[PDB]
Amino acid sequence: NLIQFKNMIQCAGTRIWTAYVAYGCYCGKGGSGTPVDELDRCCYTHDHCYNEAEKIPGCNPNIKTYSYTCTQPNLTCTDSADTCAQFLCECDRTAAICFASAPYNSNNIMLSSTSCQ
Ligand code: NA
Secondary structure, three states: OHHHHHHHHHHHOOOOHHHHOOEOOOEOOOOOOOOOOHHHHHHHHHHHHHHHHOOOOOOOOOOOOOOEEEEOOEEEEOOOOOHHHHHHHHHHHHHHHHHHHOOOOHHHEOOOOOOOO
16 A cells, blocks of 8 residues: 555655655656665565565555555555555555665755666
8 A cells, every 4th residue: 555655655754755755766656777775675675575476466566555564764564465565565564664764865866867767
């Protein structure tokens, strides 16, 4: 669930989802070239994760609602039976935690430069 993902973001970190709407070559719609930094790599992986999520029968990353808990800054994916929800929650949780641990070079914001092949 896209809504859950953004809430899952501010749980683990301090930066809201808007800070990521357009960063590097992969954070934001689509993605190309090679990630420019640690954060952009976070987004790179997240996208491949969703692409994978779609290879699961009846599994759409945008609409599928999963179960998880937030004991800030701790995230927990409670799903175990539902594979889509499980796998999908893992994607988002991984990215949320990744985002919060990686640095934010405001320079790599909105750039496309030669960097994003
Ligand atoms: Na993306």
